Amino acid sequence: SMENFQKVEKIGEGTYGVVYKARNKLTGEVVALKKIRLDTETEGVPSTAIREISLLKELNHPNIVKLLDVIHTENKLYLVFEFLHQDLKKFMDASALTGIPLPLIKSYLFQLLQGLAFCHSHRVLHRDLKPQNLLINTEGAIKLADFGLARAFGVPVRTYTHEVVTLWYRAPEILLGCKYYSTAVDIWSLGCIFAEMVTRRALFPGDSEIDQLFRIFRTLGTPDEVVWPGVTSMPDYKPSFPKWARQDFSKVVPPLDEDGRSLLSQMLHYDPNKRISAKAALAHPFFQDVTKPVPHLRL
Amino acid sequence: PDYHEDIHTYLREMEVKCKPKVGYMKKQPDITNSMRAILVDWLVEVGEEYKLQNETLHLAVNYIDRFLSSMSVLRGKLQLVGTAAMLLASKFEEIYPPEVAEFVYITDDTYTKKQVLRMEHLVLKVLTFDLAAPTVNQFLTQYFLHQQPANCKVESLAMFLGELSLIDADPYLKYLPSVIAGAAFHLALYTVTGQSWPESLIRKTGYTLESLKPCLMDLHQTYLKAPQHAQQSIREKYKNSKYHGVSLLNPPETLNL
Numbered sequence: 001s002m003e004n005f006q007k008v009e010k011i012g013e014g015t016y017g018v019v020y021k022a023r024n025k026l027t028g029e030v031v032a033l034k035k036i037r038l039d040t041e042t043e044g045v046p047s048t049a050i051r052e053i054s055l056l057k058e059l060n061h062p063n064i065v066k067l068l069d070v071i072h073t074e075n076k077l078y079l080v081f082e083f084l085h086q087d088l089k090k091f092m093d094a095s096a097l098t099g100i101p102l103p104l105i106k107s108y109l110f111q112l113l114q115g116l117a118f119c120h121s122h123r124v125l126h127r128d129l130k131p132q133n134l135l136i137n138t139e140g141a142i143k144l145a146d147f148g149l150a151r152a153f154g155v156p157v158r159t160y161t162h163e164v165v166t167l168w169y170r171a172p173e174i175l176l177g178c179k180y181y182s183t184a185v186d187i188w189s190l191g192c193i194f195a196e197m198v199t200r201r202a203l204f205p206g207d208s209e210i211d212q213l214f215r216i217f218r219t220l221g222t223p224d225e226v227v228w229p230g231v232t233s234m235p236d237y238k239p240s241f242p243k244w245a246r247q248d249f250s251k252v253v254p255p256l257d258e259d260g261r262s263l264l265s266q267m268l269h270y271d272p273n274k275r276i277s278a279k280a281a282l283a284h285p286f287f288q289d290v291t292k293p294v295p296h297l298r299l
Numbered sequence: 300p301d302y303h304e305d306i307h308t309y310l311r312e313m314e315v316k317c318k319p320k321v322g323y324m325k326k327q328p329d330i331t332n333s334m335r336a337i338l339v340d341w342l343v344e345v346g347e348e349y350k351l352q353n354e355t356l357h358l359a360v361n362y363i364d365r366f367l368s369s370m371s372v373l374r375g376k377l378q379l380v381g382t383a384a385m386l387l388a389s390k391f392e393e394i395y396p397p398e399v400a401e402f403v404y405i406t407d408d409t410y411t412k413k414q415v416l417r418m419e420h421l422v423l424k425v426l427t428f429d430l431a432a433p434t435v436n437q438f439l440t441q442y443f444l445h446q447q448p449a450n451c452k453v454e455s456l457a458m459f460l461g462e463l464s465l466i467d468a469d470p471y472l473k474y475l476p477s478v479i480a481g482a483a484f485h486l487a488l489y490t491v492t493g494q495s496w497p498e499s500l501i502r503k504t505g506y507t508l509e510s511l512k513p514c515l516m517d518l519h520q521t522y523l524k525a526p527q528h529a530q531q532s533i534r535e536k537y538k539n540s541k542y543h544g545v546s547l548l549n550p551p552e553t554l555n556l
C-alpha cells in the first residue's frame with residue numbers, strides 16, 4: 001500500500017518511469033520508488049517493466065540493488081527499491097580535485113565484478129552498465145541498478161536487440177553489428193568504467209557509432225584477423241577503416257600499475273571469446289589486497 | 300562457455316519452482332485436456348503467423364498451465380488466458396513483439412482490447428511477475444552443444460518433438476522440461492543418425508537412458524501417432540524448409556530400450 005510511504009523528494013528519471021526518495025512510515029525504512037504510469041499506456045505493461053521486475057526478483061545479491069516490492073495501485077505500477085545515497089557518476093565529479101583513492105577503486109571494481117558474475121551465472125545480461133546506473137552507499141558498497149535494458153539469455157545465445165548499451169560503454173562487437181553478443185558486452189562496459197574511475201573522464205566519449213569505433217581503434221589499435229578472427233567478415237566492418245597502431249596500456253591509463261593495466265587489457269580484449277569473464281576476473285592479482293573502505297567523501 | 304554449467308544448474312533449480320500442478324485439469328470443472336490442446340495448437344499457428352520465437356511459444360504455455368494451476372476458468376474465457384499469456388511471453392522474449400491490437404485481431408474479435416489488457420494484469424498478478432521460466436527449448440539448445448558433429452535435422456527434429464509435448468497435458472505435465480528435452484534429443488538423434496544420449500550429457504545432466512525411459516516411451520508413441528492427432532499445426536509448421544522438413548521423417552518403429 002502506498003499509504004505507508006511518505007515521499008521525500010524527486011531523485012530523477014530511470015530508463016523508464018520516475019524515481020522518488022520515500023520513507024516507510026511504520027518501519028522507518030528509506031526507499032526509492034519507481035513510478036510507471038499504466039494509463040497513457042495503450043500497450044499494457046511495458047516490456048522493460050516486465051523484464052526489470054521478473055529478473056530482479058531472482059537476483060538477490062549484496063551488489064545488486066534489491067527490489068523490495070511491486071505495488072499496483074489505480075492505473076499505476078510502483079517498484080519499491082532499497083535506497084542508495086548516490087550514483088557513481090556524481091561521486092566521480094565530486095572527486096574532481098582529490099581523485100578517488102586506489103583502495104576504493106579496487107573495492108568498487110571487485111564489487112561490480114561480483115554483482116556482474118552473479119547476473120551472468122543467472123543468465124541475465126545487464127546491457128546498460130554506466131556510472132549513472134551504479135549506486136553507492138555510505139558504508140562502501142556499490143551495486144548494479146536499472147535493469148530496464150536487461151534480458152534473460154540462452155545457451156548458446158540467439159540474436160537479441162541491437163540498440164543496446166549507452167554509446168560510450170558499447171562493445172566493439174555491437175558497434176560492428178555482430179549477429180550474436182553475450183556476457184562479454186557487460187565486461188567491456190565495466191572495463192570502460194574501471195578506466196573512468198582512475199581518470200574521472202570517459203575512456204571513449206564518442207558522438208556517433210563510427211566516432212565511437214575510431215576512438216576505440218586509436219587507443220587499442222585497429223583489430224585485424226590475428227587479434228580478432230572473423231572481424232573482417234563482420235556486417236559493419238569496412239576495409240577502408242584507418243589502421244591505427246596499438247599503443248602501450250601504460251599510456252591509456254598512466255596512473256594504473258602493472259596489475260591494474262593487466263586486468264584492464266583483459267577486460268578490453270577485442271575478441272569477446274578472449275575477453276575476461278567477471279568470474280575469472282575476481283581472482284586477478286589486482287585484487288590481492290582488496291578491502292571495503294567507506295567513501296572518502298560525505299554523500 | 301564460462302557460465303554454461305552455472306546456468307544449467309540454475310535452470311534445473313528453477314524448472315522445479317516453475318512447474319505447473321500435474322493434476323490441475325481434473326480440478327478444472329469446465330475445461331478439459333482437449334480444449335487445452337486446441338488452444339496450444341492455435342498458439343502454434345499464431346507463432347508462425349507472426350514469426351515468433353519457439354521460446355516465446357514455450358513460455359506462453361508455461362504461463363497458461365501455471366495460471367490454470369491456481370485459477371478456475373470457464374471454457375469461454377480460455378482463449379483470453381491464452382491470448383494474454385502469448386502477449387506477455389512476446390513482450391518478455393521478442394525483440395519486436397506484436398502490438399496489442401494484433402493480439403486482439405487474432406481472437407477474431409472474441410475479446411476487446413480492454414479485456415486483453417486486464418487479463419494481462421491478472422496473469423502477472425497470478426504468476427506474481429515470475430516470467431523467466433525454464434523451457435524445453437532452453438534445455439534443448441544446451442543439449443545441442445553435445446553433438447559430434449552438429450546436425451540440423453537432429454536439432455530441428457528435437458525441437459519438433461519437444462513442441463509436440465506442449466499439446467498434450469496428459470501425460471506431459473508430469474515431466475520436467477529438462478527431462479522432456481532429454482527424451483526429445485535422444486529420440487531425434489536416434490531417428491536421424493542412430494546414435495544415442497551421449498555420455499557427456501550423462502555427466503552434465505545426471506540422466507541416463509533408463510532415467511529418461513518413461514518419458515521416452517510416451518514421446519515415442521506421440522511421434523508414431525502424430526499424423527493421426529486431432530491437432531496438426533506443429534506437423535504443418537515443421538514441414539517448412541526452415542526446420543528442414545523434419546516432420547516428414549519416418550519415426551523409428553522400435554527404440555531398443
Ligand SMILES: CNc1nc(C)c(-c2nc(Nc3cccc(N4CCCNCC4)c3)ncc2C#N)s1
Pocket residue numbers: 011012013014015019032033034065081082083084085086087132133135145146
Ligand atoms: C538510473 N535509474 C535509476 N532507477 C532507480 C530506482 C535508482 C535508484 N536511485 C537511488 N538513489 C539515488 C541517489 C542519488 C542519485 C540517483 N540518480 C538518479 C538521477 C541520475 N541517475 C542516477 C541515479 C539515485 N536509490 C536506489 C535506486 C534503485 N533501484 S537509479
